[PDB]
Amino acid sequence: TLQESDKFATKAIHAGEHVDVHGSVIEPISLSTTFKQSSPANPIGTYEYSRSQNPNRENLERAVAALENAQYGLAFSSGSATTATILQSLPQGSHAVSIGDVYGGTHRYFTKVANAHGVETSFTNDLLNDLPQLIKENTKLVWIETPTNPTLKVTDIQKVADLIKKHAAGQDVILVVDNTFLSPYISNPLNFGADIVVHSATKYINGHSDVVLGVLATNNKPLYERLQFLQNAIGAIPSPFDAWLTHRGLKTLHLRVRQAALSANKIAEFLAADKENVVAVNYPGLKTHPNYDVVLKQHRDALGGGMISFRIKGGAEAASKFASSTRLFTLAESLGGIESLLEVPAVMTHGGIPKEAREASGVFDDLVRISVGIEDTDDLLEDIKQALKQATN
Amino acid sequence: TLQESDKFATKAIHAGEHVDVHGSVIEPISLSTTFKQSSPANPIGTYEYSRSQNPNRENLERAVAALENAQYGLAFSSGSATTATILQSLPQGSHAVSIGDVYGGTHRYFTKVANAHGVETSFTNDLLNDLPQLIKENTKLVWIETPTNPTLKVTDIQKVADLIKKHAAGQDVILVVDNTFLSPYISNPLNFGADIVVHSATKYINGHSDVVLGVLATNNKPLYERLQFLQNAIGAIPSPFDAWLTHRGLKTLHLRVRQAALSANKIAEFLAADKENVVAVNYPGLKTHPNYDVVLKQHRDALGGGMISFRIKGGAEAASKFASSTRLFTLAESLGGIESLLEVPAVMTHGGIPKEAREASGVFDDLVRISVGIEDTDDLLEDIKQALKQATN
Amino acid sequence: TLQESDKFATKAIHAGEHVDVHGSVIEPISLSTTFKQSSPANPIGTYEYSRSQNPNRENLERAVAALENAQYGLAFSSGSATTATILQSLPQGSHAVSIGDVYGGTHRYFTKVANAHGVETSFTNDLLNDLPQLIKENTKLVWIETPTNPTLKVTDIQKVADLIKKHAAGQDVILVVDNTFLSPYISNPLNFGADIVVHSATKYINGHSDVVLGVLATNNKPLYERLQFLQNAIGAIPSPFDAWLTHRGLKTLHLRVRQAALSANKIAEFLAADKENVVAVNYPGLKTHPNYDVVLKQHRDALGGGMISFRIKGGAEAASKFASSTRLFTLAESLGGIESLLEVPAVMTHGGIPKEAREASGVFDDLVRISVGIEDTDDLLEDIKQALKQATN
Amino acid sequence: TLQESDKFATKAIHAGEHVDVHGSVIEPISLSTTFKQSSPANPIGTYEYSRSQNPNRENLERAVAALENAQYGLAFSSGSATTATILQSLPQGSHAVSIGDVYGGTHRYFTKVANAHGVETSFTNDLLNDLPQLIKENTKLVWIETPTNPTLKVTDIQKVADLIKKHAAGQDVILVVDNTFLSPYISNPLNFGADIVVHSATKYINGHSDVVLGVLATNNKPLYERLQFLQNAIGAIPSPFDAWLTHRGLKTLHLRVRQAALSANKIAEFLAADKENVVAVNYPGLKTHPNYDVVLKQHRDALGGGMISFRIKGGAEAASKFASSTRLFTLAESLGGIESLLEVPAVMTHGGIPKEAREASGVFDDLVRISVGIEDTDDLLEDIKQALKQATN
Numbered sequence A, B, C, D: 001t002l003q004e005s006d007k008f009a010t011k012a013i014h015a016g017e018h019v020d021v022h023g024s025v026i027e028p029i030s031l032s033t034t035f036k037q038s039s040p041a042n043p044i045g046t047y048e049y050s051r052s053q054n055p056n057r058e059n060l061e062r063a064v065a066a067l068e069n070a071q072y073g074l075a076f077s078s079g080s081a082t083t084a085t086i087l088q089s090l091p092q093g094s095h096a097v098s099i100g101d102v103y104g105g106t107h108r109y110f111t112k113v114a115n116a117h118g119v120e121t122s123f124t125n126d127l128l129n130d131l132p133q134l135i136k137e138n139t140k141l142v143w144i145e146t147p148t149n150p151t152l153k154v155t156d157i158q159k160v161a162d163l164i165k166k167h168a169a170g171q172d173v174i175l176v177v178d179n180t181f182l183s184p185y186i187s188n189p190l191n192f193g194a195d196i197v198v199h200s201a202t203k204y205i206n207g208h209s210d211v212v213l214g215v216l217a218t219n220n221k222p223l224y225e226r227l228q229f230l231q232n233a234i235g236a237i238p239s240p241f242d243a244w245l246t247h248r249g250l251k252t253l254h255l256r257v258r259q260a261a262l263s264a265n266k267i268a269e270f271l272a273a274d275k276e277n278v279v280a281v282n283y284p285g286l287k288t289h290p291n292y293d294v295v296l297k298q299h300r301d302a303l304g305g306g307m308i309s310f311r312i313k314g315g316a317e318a319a320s321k322f323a324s325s326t327r328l329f330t331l332a333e334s335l336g337g338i339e340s341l342l343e344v345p346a347v348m349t350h351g352g353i354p355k356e357a358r359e360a361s362g363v364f365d366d367l368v369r370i371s372v373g374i375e376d377t378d379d380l381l382e383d384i385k386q387a388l389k390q391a392t393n
């Protein structure tokens, strides 16, 4: 096979194909540390040392770039190490801006590599209105997590990309978009003036919950050589095994996301018709979504994704309740898995954060977050129903 | 089993034991991303998210700590990520000192995390004499690679710890020892006034070269909690698979290192009587070793390790010769491999470092560096011989 | 989760659930050979010896049985060893009947286990008409490969089941149906008076062609107990890894096959309207299929499967041509791969069998066989076209 | 590397080397089902189909054969599958002979492929005295389990090979010897007139208790080609992963087996000087062993192995007691593991066999059988002591 501007599905199946003399339709698992060489100076095949590069990683990387309509890609130990290679690629003592509704990741990473006080950070909700007033103070990074977790607030990647060129032209301010929740299938941030697309491969891409891997894609060659250097040097790289496993699960990503999203929409609509036991509902798929205009311009076919957020006509109990009365959806952490899961950001995730903010940024104390899996739609829909009542009673 | 201050070998086999309701003698490979929870608040068992912690990694770490006579252990994606995690725990804008004869590692990591010019670095040969004059200039770390590659100079970990307490008491200067080549079986730096022990697990712990992973061990609960935070936050973590494989590999570590040492020594004694074709020989196990006194106070039973370094009765050729004529020792990089290898630091390794230094630090141009594996001693002894002449001829 | 007569998709996700005290959502890979015991008599948990039974294999077996709407399942090293265990459970020196359009598998296995001349074998095309005439001569087995490779002739599993109770009631003649190409999703032979369903898990269940493993399922307890005995005594079992990897791969079986089918169906009808370059088309999904009456009664939603067989308006070349000119369809062997493949049964497969037969059973010398993967539909449809011409010219 | 009649440890580390253009010092895991082809006729590399052959198996096979001082090797799903292929390779309606003290393996297998009543089987204890009288009755196979499990009775492979040439010249009676318990290291049955060496690689070869794989070796090219035939046709093949994991355990076979043996010997002497609490003790390494003369001619350095067997100065309780009072040894089935194990053949193993026999073959009801691992020797010795008293009190 040899792609030539085929469709997404065709690309998932063959992008990042491999090189085998034997003729293996399937890629082998190369865990080899080192490789023999023709002359001391240079190898008996493009590979010299695993960490520097190995076939499984390299190939998973070529695949994620393509799927992400990007020229380049790099896999790391996790999503956290990926965000972190980015932050440490920043000139010493810099500043970065990011949406509020973010994983504690930024909090963490942003700060750590900001050893003692290194990389400044000014969290900001509503990106398009405070970015100009904030765009400087040493800024060099703009971090957007398109659909926020759990509120699900979509952001206009283009309006941001522009607003930057405007309020900070000449100072190399790169824009990074976290595209984990939608996944390469639903959207491609680079196609909207984004310098780097970052994913937590643990979720959708691998999609089977058995690999903690992260990846980034960029069309900017220099920004990609720097970032790869840090990779080769700080060594927060992925295991040939995890890459290969992830590479394998991404081949059904288009299939798994399509299904996962239809179902989500069919579940949101249901919860958005029950004026009774359902207070608010969050799902970028609903035409009533606050930024549905962006959905239609960044989301393929306007798929809402697999995440749905909603608050019931009750309180913390009903929610903590729903989280258990459930039979098919499994209470836990994480998401984007092959199996349905549901979590209450407030308690589970957003812990060390006073209810003070868990009302402001959106994280309502009585909010139930859910990750739609690929189980039968009706078996799941009917299940959400069967659980509302329980909570109510 | 339940260890109770048993012997190294017993600990290698039962430290880091696992829990399994099915009563498995062998620890299963857990790749799950998440774990179910009884109540939104907390899990149906001690684990919540694989990156935060998972059975395979955690057991590996208890095992490594055990063998290192240490209370705590942490595993990461690689040696380089382990050194990294340590330098980024240092307060912003800090300095460190380290023996000259080091892997490019320090240079790299030390600088990278010293974003632009962050973590200072003053390399120094002969630690015990220039350390007091250097102990400041912003120093917070002293890095020691006990057996220097490839000169094989041994450093007294105690004298350095003491010297530190003297010329810089009151400044939390932590001492880290890279104990990779010797491995936990041959030495335990914590027992000599070292605050952290580092291992690139690929060489001898895993011992089969089929895994890139690194770990550290400490007795200091605070330093361990900080380091663990960065572990969870930057996410430069190992794959439950590479961790489980490495743990599997660790179980024959006492056997594998013991052998590799008896043979290295019996080989060193051979090259140490051939006054003809042998210029010099470097093996910490020879009673004629410069710091043999330190070998005696820090090396179990005085084993020298499996790394011999020697200079033949000729030059660049005779070495580049040997490096090939050999039948049993395989020309490449790396080491600590189960299989016998051989490398010429100068070329293969220390590249972009002008001959100027490659005669300074000790990295002689006509020096042959070998890594004794586990084949038959005599088969190996005899091969080294049949190899001298080739070179000669 | 705990299924309760849910839909296929839900079963595929939750059938064969595992048990683990750490509450992992994903089943761990258990490779362990043995299990600890409380007392000499019996284990500290349901398992005693891996080959006798281990969690990964057991859970897959339940999973497969469920998706196959059956009470029992058994996994072996391969399709072939699955067929053997069966043939070798037949009373010494017996006879069996099977549709001609069969893999060489029957040939081999049936023969081998028929040591020297043990298990008789009377291949017979057109089952329903000569089965009464051959039902005896020592028969004890009738082997149906529902969609014949490659002709794609569908057989009525009921009509045969009945015929048998007729021309041989009172002689335990077991009906075995190979349900590999269609897979549990498209059909369930048990629901049609079949004693055993077989699958070569390599193609569609594991799906990603990275595992050789076979399984069967039956509702018959005795037959299952004998078979399971041979399994434990000959030991032709798969490895816990191969089992887990297959299990992982089945979780998207419904998404994968449903797709491959709609695509296969859309590429048939195209090929089935080009009266010009297309002679005949073979796709159980066309309402013009010889046994489309049987397709409607046995195939779910009337899916045709992902196997299309057709003959262009030319000869050998044009076919061998097509098998190359194609860009998206990868020329090779096997099939039911995640990726589109095409083969010419005659050459590639049906070798050591004279053109004599290769015009009889239907294996036409100018017949193009293709397996539909999960690449984009139009990319593939458009590609078949792009291929027809090349061959033409 | 290129072996040239080097020593066992050298062959262990290099026999079975692989082919990689890249130059991997470490053999990669090839799971690929298939391989591409130069021309429809023959591939683009000596491999065409995984089953017919794949690198990981083949390389394993080469290594085992080499360690077994043999020309040929063949791996299978299990020891059982390996015994199975051998029995089904026999001419329809044959007879075999094997030592009484055997694993239910002959029993099951010998009988199964002996469909209904196919391959005869006359179990005999004391081989050299009843072999002439039984040698016929249709016999074609003579199965010898050198050290019997668990009495630990040694048999003279030469006396029996000879005895066969005398009482049955001309009838191709092949002699197979189960070399599992001693392993390639301690003995090489072919060098003693044996036509086939069988091993359960689950035990000492892989030796980490995470793989069920069996392998045989023979110098007889015709017997090897028939047997490989059945292999390819029945499909009871090992997986690429299990072969790879095993090959990786075999690299320390000589170090592990060397240690397990010294320990078991030092433990047997202890139990053979405790006139008080130890009735009898079975260990082929004690000069007082009934067949010590054979030991000294078949066993390397006269190593007794890792399996001891003994009866305590009490009865059934004292034993069941011992089997639990132990801290370091682990009560379970199996053996040859890296970690110590202990079992009571009577109950655990030999269940469905009336006490009647369990006093005949020697499987005394008050007999404790132990599998010495590689933990420290004194820790284990001191642990056996500490447990005799427990059983006593």
Ligand SMILES: *Cc1c(COP(=O)(O)O)cnc(C)c1O
Pocket: A077, A078, A079, A080, A081, A103, A105, A145, A178, A180, A181, A200, A201, A202, A203, A212, A213, A214, A334, B051, B235
């Ligand atoms: C889960 C998640 C992460 C964490 O990824 P790791 O690979 O687990 O570090 C980061 N970002 C988002 C948006 C996530 O949902």
Ligand SMILES: *Cc1c(COP(=O)(O)O)cnc(C)c1O
Pocket: A051, A235, B077, B078, B079, B080, B081, B103, B105, B145, B149, B178, B180, B181, B200, B201, B202, B212, B213, B214, B334
């Ligand atoms: C090989 C080596 C390392 C490198 O470890 P990685 O896991 O590959 O980063 C570190 N230290 C020493 C002393 C080594 O020899």
Ligand SMILES: *Cc1c(COP(=O)(O)O)cnc(C)c1O
Pocket: C077, C078, C079, C080, C081, C103, C105, C145, C178, C180, C181, C200, C201, C202, C203, C212, C213, C214, C334, D051, D235
């Ligand atoms: C490929 C195939 C087989 C072979 O299966 P193995 O797992 O290689 O033994 C058997 N049956 C069908 C119908 C196949 O398509």
Ligand SMILES: *Cc1c(COP(=O)(O)O)cnc(C)c1O
Pocket: C051, C235, D077, D078, D079, D080, D081, D103, D105, D145, D149, D178, D180, D181, D200, D201, D202, D203, D212, D213, D214, D334
């Ligand atoms: C354990 C054992 C077997 C069984 O091997 P499998 O690989 O489980 O079939 C056969 N023979 C002996 C002598 C054993 O010790």
